[PDB]
Design an enzyme around this catalytic site. Structure first.
Site, short mmCIF file in Angstrom:
data_model
loop_
_atom_site.label_atom_id
_atom_site.label_comp_id
_atom_site.label_asym_id
_atom_site.label_seq_id
_atom_site.Cartn_x
_atom_site.Cartn_y
_atom_site.Cartn_z
N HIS A 1 -8.14 5.62 -12.24
CA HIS A 1 -8.43 4.93 -13.51
C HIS A 1 -9.16 3.61 -13.26
CE1 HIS A 1 -7.00 4.31 -17.94
NE2 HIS A 1 -8.06 3.55 -17.71
N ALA B 1 -13.95 -1.46 -22.03
CA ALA B 1 -12.87 -0.74 -22.71
C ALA B 1 -12.65 0.65 -22.09
CB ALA B 1 -13.17 -0.64 -24.20
N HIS C 1 -7.65 9.28 -22.95
CA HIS C 1 -6.96 8.20 -23.65
C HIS C 1 -7.08 8.64 -25.11
CE1 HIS C 1 -6.93 3.58 -24.75
NE2 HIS C 1 -6.88 4.28 -25.87
N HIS D 1 -2.63 6.50 -18.46
CA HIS D 1 -1.56 5.62 -19.00
C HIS D 1 -0.69 6.37 -20.02
CE1 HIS D 1 -4.66 5.28 -22.00
NE2 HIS D 1 -5.40 4.46 -21.25
N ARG E 1 2.66 0.14 -30.68
CA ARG E 1 2.01 0.42 -29.36
C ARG E 1 2.75 -0.13 -28.13
NH1 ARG E 1 -4.57 0.20 -27.55
NH2 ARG E 1 -4.04 -0.14 -25.30
N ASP F 1 -6.15 0.94 -13.89
CA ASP F 1 -6.81 0.54 -15.17
C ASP F 1 -7.59 -0.77 -14.92
OD1 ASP F 1 -7.72 0.66 -17.85
OD2 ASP F 1 -5.71 1.20 -18.64
N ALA G 1 -9.72 -3.53 -17.26
CA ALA G 1 -9.70 -3.21 -18.70
C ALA G 1 -8.29 -3.40 -19.26
CB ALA G 1 -10.16 -1.80 -18.96
AG LIG Z 1 -7.40 -3.48 -26.66
AG LIG Z 2 -6.28 -3.03 -23.73
NI NI Z 3 -7.24 3.74 -21.83
NI NI Z 4 -8.87 2.17 -18.94
O LIG Z 5 -7.29 2.22 -20.41
#
Ligand SMILES: [Ag+]
Ligand SMILES: [Ag+]
Ligand code: NI
Ligand code: NI
Ligand SMILES: [O-]
Ligand SMILES: [Ag+]
Ligand SMILES: [Ag+]
Ligand code: NI
Ligand code: NI
Ligand SMILES: [O-]
Lengths: 570, 122, 100, 570, 100, 100
Positions: free
Chosen positions: D137, D170, D249, D275, D339, D363, D366
């Site tokens: 990722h 993103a 995602h 994730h 979330r 990740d 991001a």
């Molecule tokens: Ag965000």
């Molecule tokens: Ag974020």
């Molecule tokens: Ni994502």
């Molecule tokens: Ni990501």
């Molecule tokens: O992500």
């Protein structure tokens, strides 16, 4: 009209008979001759002489005797002399040493040193210019070591290693065809000349020889791989066939022989003896006797250079750390005492001064300091002047004789030993334009500008955001010679004749200049410039005292050195 | 439970080296004036000429000491060491060039040793 | 100034040592890189002062004690090595087991 | 003669039954077996065993069973086992795991693990050796992120991005043929393995497929590009044809469907759920139920790993910053609360421990930390041992079972999911020599040396100007593997079969090793080593509590972690 | 010390903060990078001290006030973000509108 | 902070000056790079204070005297040049023969 000698020297650099102090040492060099015509000195700038129709010729195309680069008014310090001249460079090579300018209007212009439309100018008035240093004991352990070397005026690194692998951390060895190929490719990105040594170990020829065919430029026999009679013999047989040099770090432990056994295995063949004093490795306690023989090209590594009050305490502990020695193992304590010896380190200072050890080198990152070969050469010369006086051969109060003897140890002699002096190692016509400019106040301490193949590779220069380049912070920085594809044209990868003939550079896509290793097997001690002395060196097995011509060689360690705390932030 | 980062908790017991191989004790004297230190894996008959011992007894053998350690002989020093048998193919090449083949060729090894002055060939 | 590569790097050590000393002054038990920074900079400033290698091998063992550092830190540091310019040139100092 | 176990372990690293603590955690690994022959251990150095005629063979040329590199005495920690062996490398690949040395004189030498003239040695005694981490990722946002990854033992980066463009900031997406081509060329200068994901979005096949032909190695469906039923379906149709992986995602906002809708669009096809806990993105609040299905390969990203007292405060605010949420928009507040959920983050710890989430990943830049995938895997394993006790499967007080389950999450399982486990992801014969050495005190925190294709790429090493490499400052640094052309031979660009067949590497002048993505479509949860559990995960829509087998999964957040303040300067 | 890339970088922030604090101590109104450096280093040293993310979100809003900084600086700084190692690992702190 | 390349570099000068001032405070005669660092940082902090180029050309000649530095250092330093942001933008200051 006449100019007084002080003003003359301030404007154009010194001339015949003027002396200059080397950094903050007691050493003085004297201008032996000068190629200029007084009144026709070349100089560049607003309203100066190198201008079209004047000192710059406006007629000739580049091919017609015109230079790519002129170094004006250089004070050359070289085994060939200490003298004043302009230096002309073309196609990356030194083509003319003499007097540059425009024969239209100037007297005494060397015919191939025309400053023309194609000519770049570097002002060397008031600078000392030497050949780039040739370090033949390099371990390739950390790429950061390259700038360290450049900042002290080193332009060629010969040695071995694959990075911080234990084999490489102890030995200057890039072992076998694949490692050698990988390091040749890595070398594509290193802004310094390089030559790679294979593993000088085996009892059959082929495993050794294939390294030479793969691209090695020489071999290293190291005790950590078994510096046995067989490894010594096979490497030398390979080297006599391939025309490359062999370096040796002999069997310290005397496991398979004593010094006389190693000499018998060498059998009169040519060999480079590394850290010949022996703190860096070799037959305990008498390895330094190697330096007396006609077939041995002897070098020191730098941490014993020169003998100081901290040396022994530092080295005993350095050896403990390096070897993982334990103080509660009596054999480790005996080993360290048999290896770190003030008697041989003190004599090493003197053997250098007598021209019996021919070469310096670093031992970079294994047991020596990448950026201090040049530094410590001069510190030694300075200590020897203090303790032994000006040498017999000197005259007019100058130290020219010692200066040529010492500058030879890190320029021309390692080049000769390695079989690469046709390309590098001295400021002579026809050799590659690896040149170091030094302000005399910084001489041997921090290079001003390092020229690699005719382009500046490294410079002490200031704020890149400033109106001019001199504001702070002034620090060592890579220059355009190191950037893009220019890194290929300004640097040489030295390789064996057989790997060159076999097309290894094309096989691997090497774009660097390829230099040929040659003429290494038919040389000896006699071929070391200003350091050609052969003699019976006696090392007492009980007391370790060193004798030459019946006389014990000893000197005191000094508490303080020049080129040290006046200069360094840490 | 003070924590030493990365510490070992080794199991109980002892490790026997060179298990199951024949051992031999011999006396060896450094007749030279400089120290000699001998590693765990050098073919014992091929060590420094100036070590005096029954050379035949070093053939096909090496020091019975932990891998990577050494026996040290100060100038003039005589002491006993224990040897173990070489393993694998029991062949030695190179080193001092006394074997270059099977360690079984005892006479050929001794003959080479004697001509080159390795001390202690009978 | 004409800083060479080592001069540039070693400024970082001094800085990390200043940071660590501030953390100690406000009562924190020091961690591994803090402790190393402190002793290292001590050695380098000792060389600048003109102490000998031998002196700094002794002193370096008393710059920090176990009650200055976190649990485990003494045992994580086998030695601390530093090279600096003494009045007689660059030399290597190694302080063995600096923190008991 | 016998050596006591303490001294043995100190000299050669631990042997059967010895345990070693992982960093400053409570986790202990135990040597399960050992390939050595006691007394014939290989080691390198002055007077040691790897010397010519002894442990080093002096007869054989490189081709004849001789290694390029031997790692001596490694403690391997791998999904295949925790055990002691030498590791042999040749042509950049692991060729032998077993016992290296010289069959002349040693018993038990693995036939293709001869140490010969061609052999480099790295001493691994007292080190733990793992496969390099595989981070699947990655956002390519800032090139400085590469060393960050290397310093924590990551050797492969799979993901997408064109630098700090909002699309890339993103989403792990390099969109379309031209961006993909540009990043493939950029990849030529990144010293780490790379695979690039295209945009998994469109309602016609061709705009998606052309990315695969251009050189993408997989696709990313991201809600920011419209994680709709159509984009999901087309990407999976493309992937089933091209044999590449799809990462997802999902639609956090539930705009076009709920979790069951996304599952229906996937329709039993293989997919990598990113994730999966959902703080990093996905169907609110129940995305984590993905991890129960047989066709889902589930990964966590790292900032929720593990659950700590600062986690929720940090994440609520991180989400506000990342999404530009406003506290005076009730919809933004509702969104953040739906979330960021302690109920699912606490359960995530436990699902990892139960082998229901199969993978870690960062990740990077991001919503996750480039250099903390490995770090946080072990922190999680340690927290779970503290709160749940040693797992049923454990024996002899060791944590071997948990260690293999956890080391699998960042080595072998992401490689399997990506279709690249034939090349990377574990220490097995025939795989690329991406290897990380760790001092046990630093395990999972800061890698000692990172080997990439058989050459060290990155090392914690000290002053390059020093006599030895250990003096301060010791810091992470790029090594010779990263320099010059060697960067090409030590790293792999992973690409789709079709781009390879279509000659994209030659088209673009790529000189890196080209690896083939394959076997991604015919795998499932069952193929995740030690993490193969499928189950009905229930997530209560009202309270967010997570149930598995009728039992609520919850644990407490911890105030303190190992591998944290003892180690880090900031 | 085993400095990783972030450790090396973040030493710079501490240094810039020390520089800024000296400038403030001699009576200068601080500028944009000075102000940012000061609050950033505060957050990172707060984490080293073992404060919580929540504490530093509050405190960071009172490290500097508008009369400490030049005209416009308060409005130039929307937030200041920093990651540091807390007793429970790396966490992100964002201080929103640090200077009113 | 939005540090540009010069901002990053010039932080080093300040750091080297802090190091040098500590060495002076403990009674050492300063060497060449120390002396340069001290005067350089003085000029840059002078610009930050809003002094004029003319003022700093005068003051820079009195920051250190020969009894503050090692033998030869005065003569090694012909001038010290530094660019810094004045209230009217970047300007160059050169202090000629700073140490008699
Ligand atoms: Ag965000
Ligand atoms: Ag974020
Ligand atoms: Ni994502
Ligand atoms: Ni990501
Ligand atoms: O992500
Ligand atoms: Ag050693
Ligand atoms: Ag050594
Ligand atoms: Ni050596
Ligand atoms: Ni060496
Ligand atoms: O050496």
């Amino acid at each position: 009209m006449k100019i007084n000698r002080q003003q003359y020297a301030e404007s154009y650099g010194p001339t015949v008979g003027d002396q200059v102090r080397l950094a903050d040492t007691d050493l003085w060099i004297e201008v032996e001759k000068d190629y200029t015509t007084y009144g026709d000195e070349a100089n560049f700038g607003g309203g100066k002489v190198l201008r079209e129709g004047m000192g710059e010729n406006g007629t000739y195309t580049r091919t017609e005797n015109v230079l790519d680069l002129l170094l004006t008014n250089a004070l050359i310090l070289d085994y060939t002399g200490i003298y004043k001249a302009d230096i002309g460079v073309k196609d990356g090579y030194i083509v003319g040493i003499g007097k540059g300018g425009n024969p239209d209007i100037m007297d005494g212009v060397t015919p191939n040193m025309i400053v023309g439309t194609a000519t770049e100018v570097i002002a060397a008035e008031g600078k000392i210019v030497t050949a780039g240093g040739i370090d033949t004991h390099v371990h390739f352990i950390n790429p950061d070591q390259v700038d360290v070397a450049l900042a002290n005026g080193i332009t060629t690194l010969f040695g071995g290693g694959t990075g911080p692998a234990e084999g490489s951390k102890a030995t200057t060895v890039t072992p076998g065809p694949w490692n050698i190929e990988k390091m040749l490719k890595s070398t594509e990105g290193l802004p310094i000349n390089v030559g790679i040594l294979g593993k000088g170990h085996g009892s059959s020829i082929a495993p050794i020889m294939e390294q030479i065919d793969a691209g090695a430029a020489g071999l290293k026999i190291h005790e950590d791989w078994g510096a046995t009679p067989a490894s010594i013999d096979r490497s030398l047989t390979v080297a006599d066939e391939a025309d490359v040099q062999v370096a040796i770090h002999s069997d310290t432990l005397n496991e398979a022989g004593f010094l006389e056994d190693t000499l018998r295995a060498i059998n009169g063949r040519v060999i480079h003896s590394f850290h010949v004093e022996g703190a860096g490795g070799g037959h305990a306690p008498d390895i330094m006797a190697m330096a007396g023989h006609p077939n041995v090209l002897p070098s020191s590594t730098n941490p014993t250079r020169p003998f100081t009050v901290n040396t022994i305490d530092e080295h005993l502990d350095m050896l403990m750390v390096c070897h993982h020695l334990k103080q509660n193992i009596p054999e480790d304590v005996a080993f360290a005492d048999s290896r770190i010896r003030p008697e041989t380190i003190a004599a090493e200072d003197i053997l250098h001064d007598l021209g019996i050890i021919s070469m310096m080198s670093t031992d970079a990152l294994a047991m020596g300091r990448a950026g201090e070969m040049v530094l410590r050469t001069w510190q030694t010369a300075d200590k020897m002047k203090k303790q032994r006086g000006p040498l017999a051969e000197e005259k007019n109060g100058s130290d020219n004789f010692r200066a040529k003897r010492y500058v030879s140890k890190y320029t021309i002699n390692p080049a000769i030993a390695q079989g690469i002096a046709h390309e590098v190692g001295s400021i002579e016509e026809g050799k590659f334009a690896d040149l170091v400019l030094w302000e005399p106040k910084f001489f041997g301490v921090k290079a001003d500008r390092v020229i690699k193949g005719g382009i500046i590779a490294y410079a002490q220069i200031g704020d890149p955001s400033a109106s001019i380049p001199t504001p702070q912070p002034v620090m060592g920085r890579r220059m355009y010679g190191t950037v893009g594809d220019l890194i290929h044209d300004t640097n040489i990868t030295f390789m064996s004749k057989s790997s060159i003939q076999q097309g290894v550079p094309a096989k691997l896509g090497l774009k660097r200049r390829i230099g040929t290793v040659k003429n290494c097997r038919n040389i000896g001690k006699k071929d070391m410039k200003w350091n050609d002395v052969t003699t019976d060196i006696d090392i007492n097995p009980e007391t370790y005292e060193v004798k030459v011509d019946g006389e014990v060689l000893t000197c005191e360690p000094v508490k303080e050195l020049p080129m040290a705390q006046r200069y360094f932030l840490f | 439970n003070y924590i030493v980062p990365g510490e070992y908790r080794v199991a109980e017991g002892e490790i026997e080296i060179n298990a199951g191989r024949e051992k031999t004790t011999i006396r060896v004297s450094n007749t030279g004036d400089r120290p000699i230190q001998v590693g765990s894996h050098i073919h014992f008959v091929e060590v420094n000429k100036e070590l005096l011992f029954d050379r035949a007894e070093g053939i096909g053998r090496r020091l019975n000491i932990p891998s990577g350690t050494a026996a040290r002989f100060e100038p003039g020093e005589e002491m006993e060491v224990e040897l173990t048998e070489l393993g694998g193919n029991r062949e030695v090449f190179g080193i001092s060039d006394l074997t270059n083949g099977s360690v079984d060729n005892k006479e050929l090894i001794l003959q080479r040793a004697k001509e080159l002055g390795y001390k202690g060939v009978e | 100034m004409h800083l060479n590569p080592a001069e540039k790097e070693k400024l970082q050590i001094f800085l990390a040592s200043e940071l660590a000393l501030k953390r100690k002054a406000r009562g924190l038990k020091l961690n591994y890189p803090e402790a190393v920074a402190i002793i290292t900079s001590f050695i380098m400033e000792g060389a600048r002062d003109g102490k000998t290698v031998a002196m700094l091998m002794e002193e370096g063992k008393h710059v920090l004690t176990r009650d200055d550092v976190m649990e485990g830190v003494p045992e994580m540091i086998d030695d601390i090595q530093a090279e600096a310019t003494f009045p007689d040139g660059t030399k290597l100092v190694t302080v063995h087991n600096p923190i008991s």
